[PDB]
Amino acid sequence: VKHFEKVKILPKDRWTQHTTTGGSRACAVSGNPSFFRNMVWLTKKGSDYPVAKGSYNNTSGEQMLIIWGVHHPNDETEQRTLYQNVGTYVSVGTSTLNKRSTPEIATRPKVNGLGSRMEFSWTLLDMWDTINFESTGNLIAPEYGFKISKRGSSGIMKTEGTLE
């Protein structure tokens, strides 16, 4: 892939029933808690976390790279105060795809203060195919897909220096 063209496929403001405004000190911005910019951390809005549902027909004219995530809490109380229910799921589905993650609340070593983890997965969505997210807990939804704008022989060099 020689060039990506970012597309807003599942805009953050659509999530009218959940809290789209997460964050942590681990993703800090100016000392203030932030998060990944292309990701949305759907949490509960006042007690409830109803079924989160998302969809996108790939009408952008090329294959599209899409990333999503599930959140693995530390204790049960994290789980309840973030998603209300225990025992949730995070289904993603296309035509080549049918993944249904279910979350693993379990204590762990503090990386960046956090004994909790986000597990991220990914797919290519073919032209005119349709991606569906449905969850009742722990989804970290995408906001964007990347469209493959330029294809060609490229590479990734593992250098630790800079360009002249």
Partner: antibody
Framework: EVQLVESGAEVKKPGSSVKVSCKAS????????FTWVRQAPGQGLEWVGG????????NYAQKFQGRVTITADESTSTAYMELTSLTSEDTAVYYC?????????????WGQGTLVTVSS | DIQLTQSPSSLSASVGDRVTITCQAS??????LNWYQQKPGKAPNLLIY???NVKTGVPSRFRGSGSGTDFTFTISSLQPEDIATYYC?????????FGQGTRLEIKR
């Protein structure tokens, strides 16, 4: 039964600043969201802002920007509202109340309030 | 910002009467609407959350209704310890707003 213990009453001269407290007692820390609603004598209810334990993020009402600053202390399960450049319009009772979720739920329980009185 | 516009501004009613109060919103706020009571001298107190839900220990006579932009709060039979001001509040959006409040007195 989660209880709320909020700081004593203050009389401050104008242009100074106040910092009020809310210790949340009877439940675990990160399930907490702290919110502050002020209320002037005779008028009614006005949101100041609040703080979400689980994300450590604070929210202000744009009315107060620059002056209000919210923090917390997990050791104490104690949150803090600090209003600066106080004018006599800031005189009100300042209730702390516990809400729910990142969207500030409903507010229960409410503390009994901290009378701040701004007067030269 | 979302305007919560509560009517009537005051309400004299006899005891045993049913009182209804309304709270209208500048926007669709789904059922993201709660209802407070502030008796004179006391702190506000939650009576109803998510438009229709009644907090435990609130007596039966309090009911909450309303779904989109218009909301209704009803005491079925006014009881002399109900005279207070009542507030509504919204989440959904975020600068968190209250109504201006509705004052319950008794008709004599």
């Amino acid at each position: 039964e989660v209880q709320l213990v909020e700081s004593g009453a203050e009389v401050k001269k104008p242009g100074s600043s106040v910092k009020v407290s809310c210790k949340a007692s009877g439940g675990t820390f990160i399930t907490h969201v702290f919110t502050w609603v002020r209320q002037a004598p005779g008028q009614g209810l006005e949101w100041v802002g609040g703080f979400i334990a689980i994300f450590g993020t604070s929210n202000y009402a744009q009315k107060f920007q620059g002056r209000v600053t919210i923090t917390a202390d997990e050791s104490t399960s104690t949150a803090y509202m600090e209003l600066t450049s106080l004018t006599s319009e800031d005189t009100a009772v300042y209730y702390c109340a516990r809400g729910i979720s990142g969207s500030y739920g409903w507010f229960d329980p409410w503390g009994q309030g901290t009378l701040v009185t701004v007067s030269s | 910002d979302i305007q919560l516009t509560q009517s009537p501004s005051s309400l004299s009613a006899s005891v045993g009467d049913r009182v209804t109060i309304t709270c209208q919103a500048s926007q669709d706020i789904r059922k993201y609407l709660n209802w407070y009571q502030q008796k004179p001298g006391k702190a506000p107190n939650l009576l109803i959350y998510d438009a229709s839900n009644v907090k435990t220990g609130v007596p039966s006579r309090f009911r909450g209704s309303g779904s989109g932009t218009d909301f209704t709060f009803t005491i079925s039979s006014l009881q002399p310890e109900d005279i207070a001001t009542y507030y509504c509040q919204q989440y959904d959006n975020l600068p968190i707003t209250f109504g201006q409040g509705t004052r319950l007195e008794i008709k004599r």
